[PDB]
Amino acid sequence: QPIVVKFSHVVADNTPKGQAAIKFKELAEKYTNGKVKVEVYPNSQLFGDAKEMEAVALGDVQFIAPSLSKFDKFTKQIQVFDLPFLFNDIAAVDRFQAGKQGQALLRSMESKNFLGLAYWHNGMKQISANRPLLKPEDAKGLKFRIQASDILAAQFQGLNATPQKLAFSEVYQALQVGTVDGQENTWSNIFSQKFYEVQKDITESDHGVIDYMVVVNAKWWNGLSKDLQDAMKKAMDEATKVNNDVAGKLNDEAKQKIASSGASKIHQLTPEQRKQWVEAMKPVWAKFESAIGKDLIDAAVASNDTKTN
Ligand SMILES: [Cl-]
Ligand SMILES: [Cl-]
């Protein structure tokens, strides 16, 4: 009777998270000599956004890797990752995650019996709708789908737009029948879930990030025999390295496919347009500073590094 272990997520197989979870499966089975069988369930086939945390708590799923925007019901510290324009680029996000404060966040939910094993990457968020979004004013009066995050809701409220919380699996349909006008996501997600086919203008804003925390039930994980836990720990580290190697290329490749399709128009901001977007979104920070903790915010800010000039 081999031990069945299930890994659930909401994205497609051909994605930074999807490819990493498949690597994890392959390696955990190898390193346990077949004693463990990993079943991977992509595209919300087993659980989606709304239920995966509960599934982990009850033992219906062993591994998940939610966006870092989806934890504000469990802690008020991880929501630091949602502050718009906090990180200039993916390199700053990774430096922050690797430092003391970023690594501390993996343990931020231990009192609720959740444990983060690793961070996985996706990429930078782009914004889209059915009209060009070149300046923040263009967003006024539009409905935007958002992940279930208080800071993302405030971010759109601040643009005098209307956020709407929806589960990832429901976004395409919402955009397709017009119950929402726009959204923010990474190129990888925008291509693989076909948002580009129902959004005619996408702006390369790079105004936030979608990255992930690999989460387990702490009690379950810590109760495993030393030999099984080491095997799976080895598999996880190696899957995390695949994720770090493929995330960038997969997003670049997605962007190109969207562009080549002709179905959407990709817009590039200029310095003055971008600077405007920054000003229009920064007040959100002051609203959440006390809840997050200024020091954590300052450490994130400091993770940015710009070459001279
Ligand atoms: Cl979902
Ligand atoms: Cl990590």
PDB file of C-alpha atoms and ligand atoms in Angstrom:
ATOM      1  CA  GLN A   1       0.000   0.000   0.000  1.00  0.00           C
ATOM      2  CA  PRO A   2       1.997   3.041  -1.060  1.00  0.00           C
ATOM      3  CA  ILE A   3       1.475   6.297   0.800  1.00  0.00           C
ATOM      4  CA  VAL A   4      -0.604   8.675  -1.310  1.00  0.00           C
ATOM      5  CA  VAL A   5       0.357  12.346  -1.028  1.00  0.00           C
ATOM      6  CA  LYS A   6      -1.688  14.972  -2.970  1.00  0.00           C
ATOM      7  CA  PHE A   7      -0.486  18.342  -4.275  1.00  0.00           C
ATOM      8  CA  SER A   8      -3.261  20.691  -5.396  1.00  0.00           C
ATOM      9  CA  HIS A   9      -3.079  24.003  -7.312  1.00  0.00           C
ATOM     10  CA  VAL A  10      -4.975  26.384  -9.580  1.00  0.00           C
ATOM     11  CA  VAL A  11      -2.676  26.830 -12.567  1.00  0.00           C
ATOM     12  CA  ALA A  12      -1.961  24.969 -15.765  1.00  0.00           C
ATOM     13  CA  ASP A  13       0.764  22.316 -16.047  1.00  0.00           C
ATOM     14  CA  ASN A  14       2.890  24.445 -18.390  1.00  0.00           C
ATOM     15  CA  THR A  15       3.694  27.118 -15.846  1.00  0.00           C
ATOM     16  CA  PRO A  16       6.290  27.986 -13.279  1.00  0.00           C
ATOM     17  CA  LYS A  17       4.233  26.423 -10.459  1.00  0.00           C
ATOM     18  CA  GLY A  18       2.858  23.612 -12.623  1.00  0.00           C
ATOM     19  CA  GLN A  19       6.284  22.492 -13.846  1.00  0.00           C
ATOM     20  CA  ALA A  20       7.736  22.618 -10.320  1.00  0.00           C
ATOM     21  CA  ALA A  21       4.969  20.461  -8.823  1.00  0.00           C
ATOM     22  CA  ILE A  22       5.503  17.838 -11.534  1.00  0.00           C
ATOM     23  CA  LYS A  23       9.210  17.847 -10.758  1.00  0.00           C
ATOM     24  CA  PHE A  24       8.351  17.419  -7.090  1.00  0.00           C
ATOM     25  CA  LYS A  25       6.211  14.367  -7.869  1.00  0.00           C
ATOM     26  CA  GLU A  26       8.914  12.740  -9.985  1.00  0.00           C
ATOM     27  CA  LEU A  27      11.657  13.290  -7.350  1.00  0.00           C
ATOM     28  CA  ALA A  28       9.698  12.465  -4.209  1.00  0.00           C
ATOM     29  CA  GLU A  29       8.747   9.119  -5.730  1.00  0.00           C
ATOM     30  CA  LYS A  30      12.334   8.512  -6.772  1.00  0.00           C
ATOM     31  CA  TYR A  31      13.911   9.424  -3.450  1.00  0.00           C
ATOM     32  CA  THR A  32      11.368   7.339  -1.520  1.00  0.00           C
ATOM     33  CA  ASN A  33      11.929   4.367  -3.818  1.00  0.00           C
ATOM     34  CA  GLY A  34       8.235   4.296  -4.700  1.00  0.00           C
ATOM     35  CA  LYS A  35       7.119   4.211  -1.040  1.00  0.00           C
ATOM     36  CA  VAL A  36       5.344   7.543  -1.703  1.00  0.00           C
ATOM     37  CA  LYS A  37       3.074   8.261  -4.659  1.00  0.00           C
ATOM     38  CA  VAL A  38       2.470  11.940  -5.414  1.00  0.00           C
ATOM     39  CA  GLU A  39      -0.784  12.884  -7.275  1.00  0.00           C
ATOM     40  CA  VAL A  40      -0.726  16.352  -8.795  1.00  0.00           C
ATOM     41  CA  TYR A  41      -4.031  18.126  -9.401  1.00  0.00           C
ATOM     42  CA  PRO A  42      -3.698  21.275 -11.546  1.00  0.00           C
ATOM     43  CA  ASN A  43      -6.263  23.879 -12.656  1.00  0.00           C
ATOM     44  CA  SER A  44      -8.345  23.627  -9.452  1.00  0.00           C
ATOM     45  CA  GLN A  45      -9.398  20.070 -10.340  1.00  0.00           C
ATOM     46  CA  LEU A  46      -9.306  18.968  -6.698  1.00  0.00           C
ATOM     47  CA  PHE A  47      -9.446  22.226  -4.718  1.00  0.00           C
ATOM     48  CA  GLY A  48      -9.293  25.894  -5.742  1.00  0.00           C
ATOM     49  CA  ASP A  49      -8.594  29.204  -3.981  1.00  0.00           C
ATOM     50  CA  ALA A  50     -11.583  29.035  -1.629  1.00  0.00           C
ATOM     51  CA  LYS A  51     -10.875  25.566  -0.127  1.00  0.00           C
ATOM     52  CA  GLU A  52      -7.193  24.608  -0.341  1.00  0.00           C
ATOM     53  CA  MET A  53      -6.201  25.968   3.095  1.00  0.00           C
ATOM     54  CA  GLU A  54      -9.086  24.092   4.774  1.00  0.00           C
ATOM     55  CA  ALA A  55      -8.131  21.002   2.765  1.00  0.00           C
ATOM     56  CA  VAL A  56      -4.590  21.209   4.198  1.00  0.00           C
ATOM     57  CA  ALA A  57      -5.967  21.689   7.742  1.00  0.00           C
ATOM     58  CA  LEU A  58      -8.190  18.595   7.448  1.00  0.00           C
ATOM     59  CA  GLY A  59      -5.643  16.417   5.639  1.00  0.00           C
ATOM     60  CA  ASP A  60      -7.464  16.158   2.320  1.00  0.00           C
ATOM     61  CA  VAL A  61      -4.417  17.592   0.528  1.00  0.00           C
ATOM     62  CA  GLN A  62      -0.732  17.401   1.587  1.00  0.00           C
ATOM     63  CA  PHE A  63       0.885  20.188  -0.432  1.00  0.00           C
ATOM     64  CA  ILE A  64      -0.390  23.491  -1.848  1.00  0.00           C
ATOM     65  CA  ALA A  65       1.344  26.662  -3.092  1.00  0.00           C
ATOM     66  CA  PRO A  66      -0.952  29.653  -2.927  1.00  0.00           C
ATOM     67  CA  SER A  67      -0.171  33.148  -4.119  1.00  0.00           C
ATOM     68  CA  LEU A  68       1.253  35.267  -1.277  1.00  0.00           C
ATOM     69  CA  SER A  69      -1.786  37.560  -1.723  1.00  0.00           C
ATOM     70  CA  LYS A  70      -4.084  34.886  -0.275  1.00  0.00           C
ATOM     71  CA  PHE A  71      -2.980  34.673   3.366  1.00  0.00           C
ATOM     72  CA  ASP A  72      -4.509  37.737   5.093  1.00  0.00           C
ATOM     73  CA  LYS A  73      -7.031  35.594   7.027  1.00  0.00           C
ATOM     74  CA  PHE A  74      -4.136  33.779   8.707  1.00  0.00           C
ATOM     75  CA  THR A  75      -1.554  36.505   9.230  1.00  0.00           C
ATOM     76  CA  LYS A  76      -1.087  40.214   8.593  1.00  0.00           C
ATOM     77  CA  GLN A  77       2.647  40.017   7.697  1.00  0.00           C
ATOM     78  CA  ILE A  78       2.740  38.086   4.379  1.00  0.00           C
ATOM     79  CA  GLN A  79       0.406  40.723   2.838  1.00  0.00           C
ATOM     80  CA  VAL A  80       3.517  42.915   2.596  1.00  0.00           C
ATOM     81  CA  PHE A  81       4.041  41.217  -0.817  1.00  0.00           C
ATOM     82  CA  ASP A  82       0.921  42.910  -2.209  1.00  0.00           C
ATOM     83  CA  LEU A  83       2.040  46.526  -1.695  1.00  0.00           C
ATOM     84  CA  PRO A  84       1.959  47.985  -5.218  1.00  0.00           C
ATOM     85  CA  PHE A  85       5.328  48.971  -6.677  1.00  0.00           C
ATOM     86  CA  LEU A  86       7.137  47.642  -3.579  1.00  0.00           C
ATOM     87  CA  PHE A  87       9.531  45.586  -5.697  1.00  0.00           C
ATOM     88  CA  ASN A  88      11.111  47.004  -8.871  1.00  0.00           C
ATOM     89  CA  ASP A  89      11.834  43.582 -10.362  1.00  0.00           C
ATOM     90  CA  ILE A  90      11.901  39.832  -9.722  1.00  0.00           C
ATOM     91  CA  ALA A  91      15.519  40.020  -8.448  1.00  0.00           C
ATOM     92  CA  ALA A  92      14.455  42.217  -5.507  1.00  0.00           C
ATOM     93  CA  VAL A  93      11.548  39.881  -4.682  1.00  0.00           C
ATOM     94  CA  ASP A  94      13.984  36.914  -4.475  1.00  0.00           C
ATOM     95  CA  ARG A  95      16.535  38.825  -2.337  1.00  0.00           C
ATOM     96  CA  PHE A  96      13.793  39.758   0.102  1.00  0.00           C
ATOM     97  CA  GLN A  97      12.484  36.165   0.230  1.00  0.00           C
ATOM     98  CA  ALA A  98      16.024  34.800   0.872  1.00  0.00           C
ATOM     99  CA  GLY A  99      16.846  37.239   3.753  1.00  0.00           C
ATOM    100  CA  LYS A 100      16.053  36.859   7.436  1.00  0.00           C
ATOM    101  CA  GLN A 101      12.696  38.687   7.419  1.00  0.00           C
ATOM    102  CA  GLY A 102      11.460  36.920   4.272  1.00  0.00           C
ATOM    103  CA  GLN A 103      12.420  33.497   5.635  1.00  0.00           C
ATOM    104  CA  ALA A 104      10.743  34.324   8.934  1.00  0.00           C
ATOM    105  CA  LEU A 105       7.423  34.625   7.084  1.00  0.00           C
ATOM    106  CA  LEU A 106       7.527  30.906   6.236  1.00  0.00           C
ATOM    107  CA  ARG A 107       6.891  30.364   9.998  1.00  0.00           C
ATOM    108  CA  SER A 108       4.343  33.203  10.400  1.00  0.00           C
ATOM    109  CA  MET A 109       1.378  30.784  10.600  1.00  0.00           C
ATOM    110  CA  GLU A 110       2.841  28.076  12.838  1.00  0.00           C
ATOM    111  CA  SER A 111       0.323  28.999  15.588  1.00  0.00           C
ATOM    112  CA  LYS A 112      -2.432  27.954  13.141  1.00  0.00           C
ATOM    113  CA  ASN A 113      -0.642  24.719  12.262  1.00  0.00           C
ATOM    114  CA  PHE A 114       0.542  25.809   8.798  1.00  0.00           C
ATOM    115  CA  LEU A 115       4.170  25.704   7.716  1.00  0.00           C
ATOM    116  CA  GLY A 116       5.828  27.231   4.649  1.00  0.00           C
ATOM    117  CA  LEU A 117       8.510  25.023   3.128  1.00  0.00           C
ATOM    118  CA  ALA A 118       9.699  27.295   0.345  1.00  0.00           C
ATOM    119  CA  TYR A 119       8.883  30.224  -1.893  1.00  0.00           C
ATOM    120  CA  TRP A 120       8.170  29.579  -5.581  1.00  0.00           C
ATOM    121  CA  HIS A 121       8.193  32.251  -8.290  1.00  0.00           C
ATOM    122  CA  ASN A 122       5.762  33.197 -11.012  1.00  0.00           C
ATOM    123  CA  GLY A 123       6.492  36.774 -12.122  1.00  0.00           C
ATOM    124  CA  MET A 124       5.489  40.410 -12.291  1.00  0.00           C
ATOM    125  CA  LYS A 125       1.816  41.469 -12.594  1.00  0.00           C
ATOM    126  CA  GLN A 126       0.577  43.213 -15.692  1.00  0.00           C
ATOM    127  CA  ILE A 127      -2.759  45.044 -15.787  1.00  0.00           C
ATOM    128  CA  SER A 128      -5.407  44.667 -18.524  1.00  0.00           C
ATOM    129  CA  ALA A 129      -8.895  45.681 -19.532  1.00  0.00           C
ATOM    130  CA  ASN A 130     -10.876  46.305 -22.683  1.00  0.00           C
ATOM    131  CA  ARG A 131      -9.371  49.726 -23.248  1.00  0.00           C
ATOM    132  CA  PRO A 132      -5.827  51.053 -23.049  1.00  0.00           C
ATOM    133  CA  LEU A 133      -4.671  51.620 -19.492  1.00  0.00           C
ATOM    134  CA  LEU A 134      -1.815  54.113 -19.984  1.00  0.00           C
ATOM    135  CA  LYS A 135      -2.595  56.358 -17.041  1.00  0.00           C
ATOM    136  CA  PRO A 136      -4.284  55.614 -13.665  1.00  0.00           C
ATOM    137  CA  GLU A 137      -7.194  57.847 -14.614  1.00  0.00           C
ATOM    138  CA  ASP A 138      -8.062  55.396 -17.439  1.00  0.00           C
ATOM    139  CA  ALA A 139      -8.923  52.865 -14.707  1.00  0.00           C
ATOM    140  CA  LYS A 140     -11.697  55.019 -13.165  1.00  0.00           C
ATOM    141  CA  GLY A 141     -15.099  53.387 -13.063  1.00  0.00           C
ATOM    142  CA  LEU A 142     -13.834  49.950 -14.160  1.00  0.00           C
ATOM    143  CA  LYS A 143     -14.442  46.654 -12.357  1.00  0.00           C
ATOM    144  CA  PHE A 144     -11.302  44.609 -11.792  1.00  0.00           C
ATOM    145  CA  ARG A 145     -11.084  41.027 -10.637  1.00  0.00           C
ATOM    146  CA  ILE A 146      -8.696  40.607  -7.714  1.00  0.00           C
ATOM    147  CA  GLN A 147      -7.289  37.821  -5.580  1.00  0.00           C
ATOM    148  CA  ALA A 148      -8.845  37.722  -2.097  1.00  0.00           C
ATOM    149  CA  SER A 149      -6.671  40.440  -0.581  1.00  0.00           C
ATOM    150  CA  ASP A 150      -7.558  43.591   1.431  1.00  0.00           C
ATOM    151  CA  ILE A 151      -4.546  45.462   0.025  1.00  0.00           C
ATOM    152  CA  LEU A 152      -5.469  44.641  -3.603  1.00  0.00           C
ATOM    153  CA  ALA A 153      -9.027  45.872  -2.923  1.00  0.00           C
ATOM    154  CA  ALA A 154      -7.690  49.116  -1.472  1.00  0.00           C
ATOM    155  CA  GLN A 155      -5.328  49.493  -4.454  1.00  0.00           C
ATOM    156  CA  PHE A 156      -8.208  49.496  -6.909  1.00  0.00           C
ATOM    157  CA  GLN A 157     -10.486  51.572  -4.641  1.00  0.00           C
ATOM    158  CA  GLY A 158      -7.678  54.144  -4.688  1.00  0.00           C
ATOM    159  CA  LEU A 159      -7.952  54.340  -8.460  1.00  0.00           C
ATOM    160  CA  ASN A 160     -11.674  54.946  -8.035  1.00  0.00           C
ATOM    161  CA  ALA A 161     -12.191  51.486  -9.549  1.00  0.00           C
ATOM    162  CA  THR A 162     -14.225  48.636  -8.123  1.00  0.00           C
ATOM    163  CA  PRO A 163     -12.447  45.474  -7.019  1.00  0.00           C
ATOM    164  CA  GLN A 164     -14.215  42.175  -7.203  1.00  0.00           C
ATOM    165  CA  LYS A 165     -12.891  39.163  -5.398  1.00  0.00           C
ATOM    166  CA  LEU A 166     -13.155  36.002  -7.506  1.00  0.00           C
ATOM    167  CA  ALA A 167     -11.531  32.590  -7.490  1.00  0.00           C
ATOM    168  CA  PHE A 168      -8.901  32.144 -10.155  1.00  0.00           C
ATOM    169  CA  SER A 169     -10.872  29.418 -11.925  1.00  0.00           C
ATOM    170  CA  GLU A 170     -13.780  31.803 -12.453  1.00  0.00           C
ATOM    171  CA  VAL A 171     -11.862  34.750 -13.922  1.00  0.00           C
ATOM    172  CA  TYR A 172     -11.905  33.811 -17.654  1.00  0.00           C
ATOM    173  CA  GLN A 173     -15.695  33.430 -17.629  1.00  0.00           C
ATOM    174  CA  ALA A 174     -16.139  36.700 -15.778  1.00  0.00           C
ATOM    175  CA  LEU A 175     -14.060  38.605 -18.337  1.00  0.00           C
ATOM    176  CA  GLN A 176     -15.779  36.744 -21.220  1.00  0.00           C
ATOM    177  CA  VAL A 177     -19.392  37.746 -20.306  1.00  0.00           C
ATOM    178  CA  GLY A 178     -18.344  41.139 -18.962  1.00  0.00           C
ATOM    179  CA  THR A 179     -19.142  40.825 -15.271  1.00  0.00           C
ATOM    180  CA  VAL A 180     -15.671  42.297 -14.761  1.00  0.00           C
ATOM    181  CA  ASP A 181     -13.751  44.590 -17.153  1.00  0.00           C
ATOM    182  CA  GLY A 182     -10.126  43.876 -16.252  1.00  0.00           C
ATOM    183  CA  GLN A 183      -7.623  42.044 -14.137  1.00  0.00           C
ATOM    184  CA  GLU A 184      -3.965  41.826 -13.124  1.00  0.00           C
ATOM    185  CA  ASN A 185      -1.753  38.818 -13.664  1.00  0.00           C
ATOM    186  CA  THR A 186       1.471  37.439 -15.053  1.00  0.00           C
ATOM    187  CA  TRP A 187       2.081  36.743 -18.710  1.00  0.00           C
ATOM    188  CA  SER A 188       2.163  33.004 -17.974  1.00  0.00           C
ATOM    189  CA  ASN A 189      -1.293  33.063 -16.410  1.00  0.00           C
ATOM    190  CA  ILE A 190      -2.642  35.528 -18.961  1.00  0.00           C
ATOM    191  CA  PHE A 191      -1.735  33.124 -21.775  1.00  0.00           C
ATOM    192  CA  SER A 192      -2.474  29.787 -20.166  1.00  0.00           C
ATOM    193  CA  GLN A 193      -5.951  30.695 -18.901  1.00  0.00           C
ATOM    194  CA  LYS A 194      -6.768  32.607 -22.090  1.00  0.00           C
ATOM    195  CA  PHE A 195      -7.412  35.996 -20.499  1.00  0.00           C
ATOM    196  CA  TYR A 196      -5.741  37.542 -23.549  1.00  0.00           C
ATOM    197  CA  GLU A 197      -8.598  36.279 -25.690  1.00  0.00           C
ATOM    198  CA  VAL A 198     -11.096  38.323 -23.636  1.00  0.00           C
ATOM    199  CA  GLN A 199      -8.977  41.427 -22.897  1.00  0.00           C
ATOM    200  CA  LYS A 200      -8.021  43.631 -25.780  1.00  0.00           C
ATOM    201  CA  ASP A 201      -5.472  45.824 -24.055  1.00  0.00           C
ATOM    202  CA  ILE A 202      -2.673  44.660 -21.683  1.00  0.00           C
ATOM    203  CA  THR A 203      -0.259  47.116 -20.145  1.00  0.00           C
ATOM    204  CA  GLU A 204       3.215  46.004 -18.994  1.00  0.00           C
ATOM    205  CA  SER A 205       2.941  47.787 -15.698  1.00  0.00           C
ATOM    206  CA  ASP A 206       5.061  45.451 -13.512  1.00  0.00           C
ATOM    207  CA  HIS A 207       3.170  46.966 -10.553  1.00  0.00           C
ATOM    208  CA  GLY A 208       3.109  43.914  -8.281  1.00  0.00           C
ATOM    209  CA  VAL A 209       4.104  40.259  -8.114  1.00  0.00           C
ATOM    210  CA  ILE A 210       2.581  36.807  -8.008  1.00  0.00           C
ATOM    211  CA  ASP A 211       4.909  34.505  -6.057  1.00  0.00           C
ATOM    212  CA  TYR A 212       3.984  31.533  -3.901  1.00  0.00           C
ATOM    213  CA  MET A 213       4.529  29.861  -0.572  1.00  0.00           C
ATOM    214  CA  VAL A 214       4.597  26.081  -0.502  1.00  0.00           C
ATOM    215  CA  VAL A 215       2.424  25.184   2.476  1.00  0.00           C
ATOM    216  CA  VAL A 216       1.877  22.018   4.527  1.00  0.00           C
ATOM    217  CA  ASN A 217       0.081  21.020   7.718  1.00  0.00           C
ATOM    218  CA  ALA A 218       2.884  21.430  10.333  1.00  0.00           C
ATOM    219  CA  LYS A 219       1.643  18.551  12.467  1.00  0.00           C
ATOM    220  CA  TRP A 220       1.466  16.230   9.448  1.00  0.00           C
ATOM    221  CA  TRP A 221       4.948  17.271   8.187  1.00  0.00           C
ATOM    222  CA  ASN A 222       6.678  17.047  11.539  1.00  0.00           C
ATOM    223  CA  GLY A 223       5.054  13.677  12.247  1.00  0.00           C
ATOM    224  CA  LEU A 224       6.625  12.001   9.219  1.00  0.00           C
ATOM    225  CA  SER A 225       9.432   9.489   9.711  1.00  0.00           C
ATOM    226  CA  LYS A 226      12.898  11.022   9.331  1.00  0.00           C
ATOM    227  CA  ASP A 227      13.535   9.035   6.136  1.00  0.00           C
ATOM    228  CA  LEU A 228      10.297  10.094   4.345  1.00  0.00           C
ATOM    229  CA  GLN A 229      10.583  13.710   5.436  1.00  0.00           C
ATOM    230  CA  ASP A 230      14.209  13.892   4.216  1.00  0.00           C
ATOM    231  CA  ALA A 231      13.301  12.358   0.856  1.00  0.00           C
ATOM    232  CA  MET A 232      10.518  14.841   0.279  1.00  0.00           C
ATOM    233  CA  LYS A 233      12.617  17.710   1.586  1.00  0.00           C
ATOM    234  CA  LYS A 234      15.281  16.792  -0.970  1.00  0.00           C
ATOM    235  CA  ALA A 235      12.660  16.634  -3.752  1.00  0.00           C
ATOM    236  CA  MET A 236      11.214  20.040  -2.702  1.00  0.00           C
ATOM    237  CA  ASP A 237      14.593  21.858  -2.752  1.00  0.00           C
ATOM    238  CA  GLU A 238      15.312  20.483  -6.222  1.00  0.00           C
ATOM    239  CA  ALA A 239      11.820  21.336  -7.487  1.00  0.00           C
ATOM    240  CA  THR A 240      12.339  24.839  -6.062  1.00  0.00           C
ATOM    241  CA  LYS A 241      15.499  25.118  -8.194  1.00  0.00           C
ATOM    242  CA  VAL A 242      13.641  24.103 -11.342  1.00  0.00           C
ATOM    243  CA  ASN A 243      10.984  26.708 -10.515  1.00  0.00           C
ATOM    244  CA  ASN A 244      13.670  29.411 -10.165  1.00  0.00           C
ATOM    245  CA  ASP A 245      15.271  28.373 -13.491  1.00  0.00           C
ATOM    246  CA  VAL A 246      12.083  28.256 -15.579  1.00  0.00           C
ATOM    247  CA  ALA A 247       9.856  31.067 -14.191  1.00  0.00           C
ATOM    248  CA  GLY A 248      11.437  33.922 -16.194  1.00  0.00           C
ATOM    249  CA  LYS A 249      11.637  32.073 -19.504  1.00  0.00           C
ATOM    250  CA  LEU A 250       8.068  30.802 -19.223  1.00  0.00           C
ATOM    251  CA  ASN A 251       6.747  34.313 -18.724  1.00  0.00           C
ATOM    252  CA  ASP A 252       8.821  35.725 -21.623  1.00  0.00           C
ATOM    253  CA  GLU A 253       7.560  32.917 -23.837  1.00  0.00           C
ATOM    254  CA  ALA A 254       3.943  33.556 -22.755  1.00  0.00           C
ATOM    255  CA  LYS A 255       4.251  37.258 -23.531  1.00  0.00           C
ATOM    256  CA  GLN A 256       5.473  36.435 -27.050  1.00  0.00           C
ATOM    257  CA  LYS A 257       2.578  34.035 -27.685  1.00  0.00           C
ATOM    258  CA  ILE A 258       0.067  36.616 -26.609  1.00  0.00           C
ATOM    259  CA  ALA A 259       1.754  39.191 -28.842  1.00  0.00           C
ATOM    260  CA  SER A 260       1.930  36.850 -31.836  1.00  0.00           C
ATOM    261  CA  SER A 261      -1.778  35.903 -31.551  1.00  0.00           C
ATOM    262  CA  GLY A 262      -2.981  39.355 -32.600  1.00  0.00           C
ATOM    263  CA  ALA A 263      -5.951  38.973 -30.207  1.00  0.00           C
ATOM    264  CA  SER A 264      -4.670  41.605 -27.786  1.00  0.00           C
ATOM    265  CA  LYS A 265      -2.559  44.795 -27.908  1.00  0.00           C
ATOM    266  CA  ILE A 266       0.454  45.053 -25.518  1.00  0.00           C
ATOM    267  CA  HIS A 267       1.236  48.572 -24.255  1.00  0.00           C
ATOM    268  CA  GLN A 268       4.528  49.814 -22.773  1.00  0.00           C
ATOM    269  CA  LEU A 269       4.466  52.624 -20.223  1.00  0.00           C
ATOM    270  CA  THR A 270       6.833  55.553 -20.193  1.00  0.00           C
ATOM    271  CA  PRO A 271       8.699  56.931 -17.152  1.00  0.00           C
ATOM    272  CA  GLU A 272       6.080  59.706 -16.763  1.00  0.00           C
ATOM    273  CA  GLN A 273       3.116  57.349 -17.146  1.00  0.00           C
ATOM    274  CA  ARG A 274       4.730  54.862 -14.742  1.00  0.00           C
ATOM    275  CA  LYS A 275       5.667  57.562 -12.238  1.00  0.00           C
ATOM    276  CA  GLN A 276       1.971  58.577 -12.276  1.00  0.00           C
ATOM    277  CA  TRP A 277       0.872  54.967 -11.600  1.00  0.00           C
ATOM    278  CA  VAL A 278       3.317  54.841  -8.692  1.00  0.00           C
ATOM    279  CA  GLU A 279       1.927  58.053  -7.128  1.00  0.00           C
ATOM    280  CA  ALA A 280      -1.650  56.890  -7.540  1.00  0.00           C
ATOM    281  CA  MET A 281      -1.038  53.584  -5.729  1.00  0.00           C
ATOM    282  CA  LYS A 282       1.434  54.506  -2.961  1.00  0.00           C
ATOM    283  CA  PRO A 283      -1.144  55.870  -0.486  1.00  0.00           C
ATOM    284  CA  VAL A 284      -2.280  52.263  -0.043  1.00  0.00           C
ATOM    285  CA  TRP A 285       0.918  51.597   1.903  1.00  0.00           C
ATOM    286  CA  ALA A 286       0.141  54.089   4.738  1.00  0.00           C
ATOM    287  CA  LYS A 287      -3.207  52.415   5.303  1.00  0.00           C
ATOM    288  CA  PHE A 288      -1.524  49.031   6.030  1.00  0.00           C
ATOM    289  CA  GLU A 289       1.822  50.082   7.550  1.00  0.00           C
ATOM    290  CA  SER A 290       0.790  49.512  11.177  1.00  0.00           C
ATOM    291  CA  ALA A 291      -0.755  46.135  10.476  1.00  0.00           C
ATOM    292  CA  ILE A 292       2.263  44.895   8.557  1.00  0.00           C
ATOM    293  CA  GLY A 293       4.974  46.531  10.646  1.00  0.00           C
ATOM    294  CA  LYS A 294       7.166  49.349   9.356  1.00  0.00           C
ATOM    295  CA  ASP A 295      10.386  47.361   9.839  1.00  0.00           C
ATOM    296  CA  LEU A 296       9.182  44.529   7.584  1.00  0.00           C
ATOM    297  CA  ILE A 297       8.133  47.023   4.966  1.00  0.00           C
ATOM    298  CA  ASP A 298      11.510  48.753   5.214  1.00  0.00           C
ATOM    299  CA  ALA A 299      13.342  45.447   4.740  1.00  0.00           C
ATOM    300  CA  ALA A 300      11.311  44.723   1.636  1.00  0.00           C
ATOM    301  CA  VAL A 301      12.004  48.212   0.287  1.00  0.00           C
ATOM    302  CA  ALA A 302      15.705  47.756   0.972  1.00  0.00           C
ATOM    303  CA  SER A 303      15.749  44.510  -1.018  1.00  0.00           C
ATOM    304  CA  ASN A 304      15.668  46.648  -4.170  1.00  0.00           C
ATOM    305  CA  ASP A 305      18.977  47.247  -5.850  1.00  0.00           C
ATOM    306  CA  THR A 306      19.455  49.494  -8.868  1.00  0.00           C
ATOM    307  CA  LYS A 307      22.716  49.673 -10.790  1.00  0.00           C
ATOM    308  CA  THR A 308      24.458  53.035 -10.786  1.00  0.00           C
ATOM    309  CA  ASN A 309      22.917  55.896 -12.827  1.00  0.00           C
TER     310      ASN A 309
HETATM  311 CL    CL B   1      -9.779  28.436  -8.044  1.00  0.00          CL
HETATM  312 CL    CL B   2      12.693  29.542   0.167  1.00  0.00          CL
END
